[PDB]
């Protein structure tokens, strides 16, 4: 086993049906239908001496925490004490030895001709390499291309409620800090269920859905604790993240750095609250809604959201924010 060629992991039927959706420093994102269900494929370069896309290759023991936290966050959606379906499930992980097949290369070329990419052409890579394959379940369209597609303010309220509830269960269960909620990292999926079930510490509750479901992805820079041991990544020696400008998302990194005195190994749940603040900032300024604001009740909820935005920062944690702020009662 181990480094098998991509033929076994990806048979011809799935290769011809791959559409390429996203990109990043990590690697590639592909979409295909397998077992009569659309599944997401993420493939990354591993254990190479070469330099690609402005960074050298990553090494295996540094990518192990990624899969550990992914499989741990996947499993909690079945636990009886604390449960929610706000995460993406793990299907399979393997290792691939070889080069890049031409079909998905032409698919990337199609994407580049349509919208474009900021990375290099992955055609120089030889047979002797290794690769990593990630199978995730389809989430939908992220918030970044859905700016002109939301229904009204009630949908926004439900979105914030679902995000806050999911993070609350995450913290109450596994003491989680994910730290990278930029608005291109939340997934929306159409649904028919009218209400959602979430239980924290053995007490159940229900949330209106308005026909949408929310999930979180891209946990490459998260922290977790389990059975006295702590899993995370130390980023205290690379400062290009804290030199950003032009957006509040660039500022929040330096803000949490100020908060945690440059100690990434501590549990500071307040860090998530600033991310919720940032998300609320986008929902009030960088959004356009189909429906106007004429109905008095929707004016009321608009005032509620404004007060929530301006008075969240006095609050301690996500769970306390869930059980204390006036929005959710």
């Amino acid at each position: 086993k181990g480094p098998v060629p991509f033929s076994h992991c990806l048979p011809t039927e799935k290769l011809q049906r791959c559409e390429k959706i996203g990109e990043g420093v990590f690697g590639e994102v592909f979409q295909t239908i397998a077992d009569h269900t659309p599944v997401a494929i993420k493939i990354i370069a591993i254990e190479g001496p070469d330099l690609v896309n402005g960074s050298h290759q990553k090494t295996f023991e540094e990518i192990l925490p990624e899969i550990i936290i992914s499989k741990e966050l996947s499993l909690l959606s079945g636990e009886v004490c604390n449960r929610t379906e706000g995460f993406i499930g793990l299907n399979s992980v393997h290792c691939v030895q070889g080069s890049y097949p031409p079909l998905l290369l032409k698919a990337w070329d199609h994407y580049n001709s349509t919208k474009g990419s900021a990375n290099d052409r992955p055609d120089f890579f030889k047979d002797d390499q290794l690769f990593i394959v990630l199978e995730f379940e389809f989430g939908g369209i992220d918030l970044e291309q859905m700016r002109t597609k939301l229904s009204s303010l009630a949908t926004a309220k439900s979105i914030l409620h679902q995000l806050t509830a999911s993070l609350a269960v995450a913290e109450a269960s596994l003491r989680f800090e994910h730290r990278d909620l930029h608005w291109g990292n939340v997934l929306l999926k159409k649904t028919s269920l009218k209400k959602l079930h979430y239980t924290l510490n053995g007490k159940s509750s229900t949330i209106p859905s308005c026909g949408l479901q929310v999930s979180i992805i891209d946990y490459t820079l998260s922290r977790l604790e389990r059975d006295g041991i702590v899993v995370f990544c130390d980023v205290s020696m690379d400062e290009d993240l804290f030199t950003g400008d032009g957006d509040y998302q660039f500022d929040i990194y330096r803000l949490m750095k100020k908060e945690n005195n440059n100690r990434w190994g501590e549990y500071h749940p307040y860090s998530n609250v600033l991310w919720l603040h940032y998300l609320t900032d986008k929902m009030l300024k960088q959004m356009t809604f189909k429906t106007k604001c004429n109905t008095p009740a929707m004016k009321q909820i608009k005032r509620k959201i404004q007060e929530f935005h301006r008075t969240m920062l006095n609050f301690s944690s996500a769970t306390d924010l869930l059980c204390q702020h006036s929005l959710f009662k």
């Binding site: 990043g24 990278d180 930029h182 490459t220 820079l221 290009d240 993240l241 950003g244 400008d245 660039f250």
Partner: peptide, 4 residues
Amino acid sequence: RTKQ
């Protein structure tokens, strides 16, 4: 993204 994470890095500008």
